[PDB]
Every structure is written in structure tokens, then in C-alpha cells.
Design a protein around this ligand. Structure first.
Ligand code: NA
Length: 129
């Protein structure tokens, strides 16, 4: 499923991401935009054997089990395929653990490269939240 900017913002707000860990909703929408382009089925195979899955591109080496990543942990206790659903619940709950893992939102490279320090409020414009 390809989420609409405000449609996603609303969904994320429902799931408690707005100001979660001090990170405004705009930060989360911006991260999703640059990580997966709002596409829940987004997958990116890395060179180390791991793969990034879904709307927030969660990595299979430590957060979900895809059965093909060497020395992989399943910290979120879910199959990586669950992070590919149109429903964002699994991704949000797992992201909540990732952002609290000692690096804040820096865990998401696209967020750090295209959202960090910018006017993230723009990502929530026109939205009826
Ligand atoms: Na894993």
C-alpha cells in the first residue's frame, strides 16, 4: 500500500508517534517519506546479508526475522514479512523500540540525511490531524 502524506500522518498520530521520545510527527512522516516513499511494501537488500523492510525500512539483522540474515537477532519478535503489511501497527511498535535504542532517530539514515535539522513541520502541512 502507498500511503498519502496526511493519511500516514494521521495513522502515525493514532499510534502515538507524535512527540514520541521528543520527536514531532513531522520527523516521522519525513523519515517514512525518504526511507520508503510511503510504500509499505518497500524492501532494500543490503550488502551484509540483511534487508530493510517496510515503510520505516527496519533491518533484519537485529529487529525482525526473515530467516536469511546471518547472526540475526529478532528484537521486535516478528517476522520481517509482518513489516510489509498495509497496516502500520507492527512497524510503529518496532520503531518505538528502535528510537529508544540509544541513538534516537539517527537509527534511520534517510532521516539523518534528509530530515534532521530541517523544518519538519512542512511534512504535516494541510493535514487534518
Ligand atoms: Na533477525
Amino acid at each position: 500500500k502507498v500511503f498519502g502524506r496526511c493519511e500516514l500522518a494521521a495513522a502515525m498520530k493514532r499510534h502515538g508517534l507524535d512527540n514520541y521520545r521528543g520527536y514531532s510527527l513531522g520527523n516521522w512522516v519525513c523519515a517514512a517519506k525518504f526511507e520508503s516513499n510511503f510504500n509499505t511494501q518497500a524492501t532494500n537488500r543490503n550488502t551484509d546479508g540483511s534487508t530493510d523492510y517496510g515503510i520505516l525500512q527496519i533491518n533484519s539483522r537485529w529487529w525482525c526475522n526473515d530467516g536469511r540474515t546471518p547472526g540475526s537477532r529478532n528484537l521486535c519478535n516478528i517476522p520481517c514479512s509482518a513489516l510489509l503489511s498495509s497496516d502500520i501497527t507492527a512497524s510503529v511498535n518496532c520503531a518505538k523500540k528502535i528510537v529508544s535504542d540509544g541513538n534516537g532517530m539517527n537509527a534511520w539514515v534517510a532521516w539523518r540525511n534528509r530530515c534532521k535539522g530541517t523544518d519538519v513541520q512542512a511534512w504535516i502541512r494541510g493535514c487534518r490531524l
